[PDB]
Amino acid sequence: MVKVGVNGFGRIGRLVTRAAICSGKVEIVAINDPFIDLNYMVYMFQYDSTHGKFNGTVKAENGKLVINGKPITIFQERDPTNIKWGEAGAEYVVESTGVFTTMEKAGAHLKGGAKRVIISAPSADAPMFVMGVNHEKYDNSLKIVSNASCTTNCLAPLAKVIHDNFGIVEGLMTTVHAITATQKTVDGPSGKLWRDGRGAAQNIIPASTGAAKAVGKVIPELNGKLTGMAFRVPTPNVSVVDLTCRLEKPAKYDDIKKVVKQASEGPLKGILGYTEDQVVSCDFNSNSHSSTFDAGAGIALNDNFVKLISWYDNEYGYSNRVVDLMAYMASKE
Amino acid sequence: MVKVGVNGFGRIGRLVTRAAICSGKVEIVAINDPFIDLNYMVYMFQYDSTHGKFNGTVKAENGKLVINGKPITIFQERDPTNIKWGEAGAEYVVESTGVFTTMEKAGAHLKGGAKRVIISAPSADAPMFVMGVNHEKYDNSLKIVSNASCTTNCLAPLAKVIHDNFGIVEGLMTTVHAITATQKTVDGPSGKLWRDGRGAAQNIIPASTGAAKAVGKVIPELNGKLTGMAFRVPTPNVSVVDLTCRLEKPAKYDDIKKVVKQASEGPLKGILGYTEDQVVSCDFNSNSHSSTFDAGAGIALNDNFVKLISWYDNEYGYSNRVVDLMAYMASKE
Amino acid sequence: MVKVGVNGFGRIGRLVTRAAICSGKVEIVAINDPFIDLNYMVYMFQYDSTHGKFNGTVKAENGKLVINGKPITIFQERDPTNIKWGEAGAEYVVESTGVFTTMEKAGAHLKGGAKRVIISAPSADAPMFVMGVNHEKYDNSLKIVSNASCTTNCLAPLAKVIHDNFGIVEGLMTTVHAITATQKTVDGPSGKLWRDGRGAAQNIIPASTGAAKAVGKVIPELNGKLTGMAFRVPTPNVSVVDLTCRLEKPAKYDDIKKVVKQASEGPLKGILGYTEDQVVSCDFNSNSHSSTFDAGAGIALNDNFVKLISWYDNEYGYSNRVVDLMAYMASKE
Amino acid sequence: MVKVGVNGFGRIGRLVTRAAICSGKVEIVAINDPFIDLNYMVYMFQYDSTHGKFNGTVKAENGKLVINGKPITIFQERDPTNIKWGEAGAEYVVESTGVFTTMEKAGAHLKGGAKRVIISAPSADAPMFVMGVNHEKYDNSLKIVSNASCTTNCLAPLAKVIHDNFGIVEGLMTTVHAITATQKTVDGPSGKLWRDGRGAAQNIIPASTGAAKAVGKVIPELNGKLTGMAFRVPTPNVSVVDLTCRLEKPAKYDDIKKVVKQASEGPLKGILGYTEDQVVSCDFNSNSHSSTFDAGAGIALNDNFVKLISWYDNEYGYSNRVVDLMAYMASKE
Ligand SMILES: NC(=O)c1ccc[n+]([C@@H]2O[C@H](COP(=O)([O-])OP(=O)(O)OC[C@H]3O[C@@H](n4cnc5c(N)ncnc54)[C@H](O)[C@@H]3O)[C@@H](O)[C@H]2O)c1
Ligand SMILES: NC(=O)c1ccc[n+]([C@@H]2O[C@H](COP(=O)([O-])OP(=O)(O)OC[C@H]3O[C@@H](n4cnc5c(N)ncnc54)[C@H](O)[C@@H]3O)[C@@H](O)[C@H]2O)c1
Ligand SMILES: NC(=O)c1ccc[n+]([C@@H]2O[C@H](COP(=O)([O-])OP(=O)(O)OC[C@H]3O[C@@H](n4cnc5c(N)ncnc54)[C@H](O)[C@@H]3O)[C@@H](O)[C@H]2O)c1
Ligand SMILES: NC(=O)c1ccc[n+]([C@@H]2O[C@H](COP(=O)([O-])OP(=O)(O)OC[C@H]3O[C@@H](n4cnc5c(N)ncnc54)[C@H](O)[C@@H]3O)[C@@H](O)[C@H]2O)c1
Q: Which residue, among A187, A203, C28, has the nearest Cα to B282 in the 3D structure?
């Protein structure tokens, strides 16, 4: 059971902890967040507006955060170099602050005795992995890796299946995406991204994303064949992917449904989901899949030009794939 | 100006009333709504959560709705065949109830001596017109007419410019659409449309729309080449079109911007807009355009495959177009 | 194990069904709702935007809704006298349609062979009971009863503790309350409650409520000493009571906290809760208490004039009280 | 017109600017905000999610922000001691950052040449003024003043009228308050105000407020007779006070209505409003009154115990009062 420290006890940091506890695939032994002290951590982890009260016990005791009788070391460092992950026993580190996405910044945890670091975001230079799509290309020389973005984890498993069976000539993706922490309650300053500063609950907000091009990194055959953009809308969680693509081989929509469902029951089970029910976004709150294909929502213009819809819990789905990737990395040591 | 009766004093009926008064192109003289009495019509027309309090006077005076000194006859009839449009002097009738959208049902208004009917919705069998696209196909023999859907009025002006300049081989459309009256505040019964019954402000809700199909009706050359679907999101008003289309002729994104903005400054002024600002949805509330191209939000994959974004105030833009079509129909008499 | 039919498979009817199964205190055998056919009930019972996917199996089998392997008879009657509650073995009927709240109208269920009716709302003439306050005044001569309102089940337990210990001279209550099914997604017609027609997700909407007055009926010593009003605010669920009362005997706040906490762990356990944590409304979603005293949110002016705050899940708290009352009435036959 | 410099170009800062231009009572000549450069200021002033687009011109030219052709000097300083207000002609400074609310901190603008400072918020030690209530107590020796909070500006005009006619023995106040910039879009860190950290659009959030107590500063006869608390709710703007008070002299609700209405038509014109319509909060967006009595929402228990209800646009009503106070101060020089 690989021991894990979390840097950044935010949405992703706390839900990784819930998924680590829930699945037992990894063990959280240390947490670091300079803006959330140990008593505050008890509160932030126990109560959750989106995913509900934690089902379990959580207390502060002898300076450690004790969750289900298991004590966790709490640090309060702003500079990742000064965290002593080694003496806390943390071998792997989840880099879920949002501000250390480069190998040089993420490498700071290796000074502290961490063995490897998993950035919970896309990186400019760290190798990116998507469970079920290219994770087997991880090898032990990579001490710093990225689990990509939540959108790419929705789009790449779907894209994998469509391209393997039919061939994607080209594709454009829109993601209608839930609100996140970088947004603003009311019109306010947002530096380089003026749209993101506008009132979160008031607006549909266009945003730029590299998540679709990133699919070309996890699936090299799709390099230069996909891009896309995003709309942020006033919901607290759960997001949807809309992939308009042009297929090489003609495929009836029922054929797309059969290979996607088949893949959801086989090698991609737990990653790629399939449904034909009249779902809406709240039906995926706390759903641990990366991607759930929505058979009824999509629509074909003809056998070579289709629009495919897939849901994802950007918070809890992505957190479960951070856990899965660390479990798999542990298994290749 | 032609004298108009309004059947259904809902979102569209009251905003069509506002658009007439504001523009002065047509004159409301009569209104029918069996679920809203005269005093309640003073309240619902005066106050508006989305567009604000009406700027002007509105009162109940001796059985008439008096707006800025002008009296409007009020009817309370469930069956359109019993509305006495002639007596009130109403020559055209805007059918905006949502429940009389076929030729046979909307024709009931001619028994009451109205001369023409304009259905504020798509119709299965009435001729469909869109200002700036095919409205010069209207002729005086058509007594029952559809102004199509808000989404069709957004997409068809943009498609027209693109198809005229580069050729649309095929296109798939998504509209992120604000909430409407057919939705529910909490999970509740929704007849044949299960997703529509789910809590409106809690969910992204996939939905069908034939708006993209209906462009093939106002632009016959694109018949069979466009379809799409919708996402209902939790905002009060303003919607956005997301069109992914294949072009015949290679088009750089700068060339698309230029022909669209050229269209907006010329023959499609007031109908198709153009902006390069970092807009969000609220910036189009109470905007009277049919469609506003967002130059920074869209994205090209290559010279023949692009995604184009266009905003539309689904309430007030559409209502202005109903007015415009009636003024145009009037000028043809 | 009393057998129960549900009239009205809405918010309350489906959470009463859920609470019945989850608690085991009563057995649902019959459900009637002319607007939800059998396949639609599978869908509406299984997916819930507010409370999540039902944790168990639900399917349609041989004309029966089969929940956790137990089949339930489905009726589709609009007139209650045509429901054959007797043949389906329903002994008690939960009247949760919102449109049969008086004794003459709710008595229609006795024609079909039901032996008692529990109206899931206030009633003009049927006797009202609140669990933990006055439920022991129920006796076997009463075949039509009302379980009052959600707000009354929150207010009455707190008001009982405060009054039994310090005497309430007079009190005024505001409840800040979540969206309910009678509200509209956008400004639309609302019969005689005009403010209720305005866009639910955009507005704070003042509203009348007889809940505070009704406490005088379940606590007769408080007759004519309490009234109040409501604000409907854009949340899907969970409401809060804000009670401002004059006391007879001087009471410092910490003494009010002490006796309320003591009540919450004694005879009002499971009905009246108590907390000192920094809670907000989502921390009570799917909470089964009638009323949770919020220690840190209240405030006193002096020892005789205080502002008391209590949270309640207006959907799930109330539905459990319906189930609890029917188990109590069954035990007394 | 006194020349005014604005420190903090946020909700209040920008809307004070709008109000100043719309009313012509003071002139804006300088703005300081180190987190919004010139070109971004053009965008943030031009577009407003809550209040609509600026009706007028705004552009950047020669390093100045030019609004309706008049040039405004732009500083980018984090320490108010370094702002050269005097050189830019700014004689009064609106301190609207939220981080310099004491006299020792707000006095920092005096070293730059400003003559007086108006803190846009409550202050621990600066004299507070509420227009229409105690503004005549201002005199020219006062160089650092406070315009109190939005809520105090709503409560004090009403309290004044009620107290001058009937005598307030004691009162308790709840404000149902819209979201502000200090809150979070999702559950995040919030110092020692833990509840303020929870998802703003997801929750009813109880919060402390000094507003009712502050009424005792602007109306000394009521010192120590008022307190209360707050509920933050998911609306972008407009708030409501709920004052529960005991009266000394008996007052039937009609008498309360009558004196509030005559105050709103006389001395408190433009500050205290009166309405009997079925209003909801959106009906007060961009309303410039401090406080609008809602006659139909309130309720009396008896002739000495009553609950009074008053709306306020916390953004624009407060902003207009900052302009009114500065104009009144300028008339006194
Ligand atoms: N849907 C999502 O929320 C989502 C999904 C996928 C990926 N991500 C990404 O994961 C990362 C975390 O995202 P999040 O949503 O949890 O944001 P968040 O704001 O909720 O959490 C960020 C945390 O970083 C903490 N932190 C710890 N050390 C810090 C330090 N030295 N400096 C600054 N902050 C420090 C902060 O206190 C804060 O709690 C981001 O890169 C994000 O883009 C987010
Ligand atoms: N809201 C939009 O964005 C939009 C845009 C374009 C087109 N439309 C279409 O316009 C039509 C009306 O839409 P809406 O949003 O205004 O719905 P709405 O519910 O707001 O208005 C419907 C009105 O019709 C009244 N009504 C019901 N039955 C009636 C009857 N027999 N006779 C007369 N009046 C009756 C209702 O009381 C109500 O006031 C629909 O077909 C809609 O699809 C809507
Ligand atoms: N939602 C709450 O928080 C809450 C709390 C306490 C009490 N109540 C009361 O419970 C009752 C139901 O409330 P709700 O929120 O579930 O409303 P709802 O609209 O969600 O459900 C009402 C159900 O009744 C069905 N129905 C309508 N007419 C019917 C008829 N003749 N016969 C059988 N079924 C019919 C409807 O299809 C609908 O499903 C109301 O009186 C309400 O005041 C509601
Ligand atoms: N928002 C309301 O409803 C309301 C109403 C009445 C009073 N107030 C009070 O007015 C003040 C402004 O609050 P707000 O939320 O509307 O504004 P805000 O949070 O939207 O912006 C405040 C501005 O201060 C800027 N700023 C300028 N100089 C600064 C400096 N040295 N350091 C830090 N920031 C600087 C920041 O960029 C920011 O834009 C607060 O004290 C508030 O309590 C607010």
A: A203
